[PDB]
Amino acid sequence: KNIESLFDYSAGQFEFIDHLLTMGVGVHFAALIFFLVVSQFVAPKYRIATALSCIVMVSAGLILNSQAVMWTDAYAYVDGSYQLQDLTFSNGYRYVNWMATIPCLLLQLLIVLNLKGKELFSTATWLILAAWGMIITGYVGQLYEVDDIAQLMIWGAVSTAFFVVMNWIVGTKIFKNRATMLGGTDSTITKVFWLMMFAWTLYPIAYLVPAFMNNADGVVLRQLLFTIADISSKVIYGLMITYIAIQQSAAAGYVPAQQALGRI
Numbered sequence: 566k567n568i569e570s571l572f573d574y575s576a577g578q579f580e581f582i583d584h585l586l587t588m589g590v591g592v593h594f595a596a597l598i599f600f601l602v603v604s605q606f607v608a609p610k611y612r613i614a615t616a617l618s619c620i621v622m623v624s625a626g627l628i629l630n631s632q633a634v635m636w637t638d639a640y641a642y643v644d645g646s647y648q649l650q651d652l653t654f655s656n657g658y659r660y661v662n663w664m665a666t667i668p669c670l671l672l673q674l675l676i677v678l679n680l681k682g683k684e685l686f687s688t689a690t691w692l693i694l695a696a697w698g699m700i701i702t703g704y705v706g707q708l709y710e711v712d713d714i715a716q717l718m719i720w721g722a723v724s725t726a727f728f729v730v731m732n733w734i735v736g737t738k739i740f741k742n743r744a745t746m747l748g749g750t751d752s753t754i755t756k757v758f759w760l761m762m763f764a765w766t767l768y769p770i771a772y773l774v775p776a777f778m779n780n781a782d783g784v785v786l787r788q789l790l791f792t793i794a795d796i797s798s799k800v801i802y803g804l805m806i807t808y809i810a811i812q813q814s815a816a817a818g819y820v821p822a823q824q825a826l827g828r829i
């Protein structure tokens with residue numbers, strides 16, 4: 566049902582996708598160790614925001630690892646090209662994984678925005694429901710990326726509505742609670758918003774690849790877009806969230822945070 570299954574791949578195409586996914590694994594698990602070691606310099610009220618980045622690194626790292634092994638399982642070099650064998654490859658499992666990873670990305674944002682108690686629970690709940698609506702409708706949509714492009718587009722439109730509303734909740738909370746943020750991170754959090762807008766928008770672009778480039782090079786392009794988007798939305802984003810957590814910790818008087826920033 567996926568466009569990947571339609572084509573044979575050159576040695577170059579096949580190996581490049583393998584390298585993309587493998588590099589993705591390495592970057593996330595390398596970043597994982599970074600978040601782990603810096604977590605001790607984060608104040609208790611923010612420390613979970615850094616822990617969530619560890620959770621995202623392993624979650625994303627495992628899905629990229631799984632995709633890479635699926636890639637090599639599904640294809641074999643036969644008569645001059647990589648051809649589909651008995652096992653299958655699908656991006657569908659990425660969608661399933663977003664059901665967990667996207668709430669984690671949103672939660673760590675709410676934490677450094679200094680949301681607490683009732684407002685935190687209610688905001689998280691609405692955000693997660695919006696994200697799940699986006700993901701599920703998008704998942705349904707890509708089931709038709711070969712059979713029914715018109716249906717892919719309509720489900721994509723519904724998904725985009727959830728996307729836009731989710732982003733509106735995010736923007737509203739960010740620009741409202743920006744003033745509560747310490748150590749100059751009121752400025753930094755604005756860049757985080759724009760980073761999210763940019764990085765997350767790459768995913769619906771990848772979703773539409775079967776509509777504007779239905780060929781083997783389109784398959785490569787989609788994996789390339791996922792790679793850019795994954796690294797930007799999880800790793801670079803996580804680094805900014807953790808930076809914001811540490812800076813606010815230091816400004817709140819947390820001594821390990823103050824000492825850590827002093828060494829650099």
Ligand SMILES: *C/C=C(C)/C=C/C=C(C)/C=C/C1=C(C)CCCC1(C)C
Nearest residue numbers: 700703724725728765768769772798
């Ligand atoms: C780490 C993974 C992340 C941040 C994934 C984000 C995914 C999206 C923003 C997906 C958006 C979609 C649309 C807005 C329309 C087409 C269907 C989706 C699910 C690909």
Ligand SMILES: CCCCCCCC/C=C\CCCCCCCC(=O)O
Nearest residue numbers: 577578579581785789792793796797
């Ligand atoms: C934050 C951005 C992260 C960027 C990650 C991507 C790094 C590698 C990117 C691709 C370089 C282009 C490689 C040339 C493609 C050759 C075409 C092919 O062989 O199929």
Ligand SMILES: [Cl-]
Nearest residue numbers: 608609610611
């Ligand atoms: Cl604290």
Ligand SMILES: [Cl-]
Nearest residue numbers: 625662663666
């Ligand atoms: Cl993920």
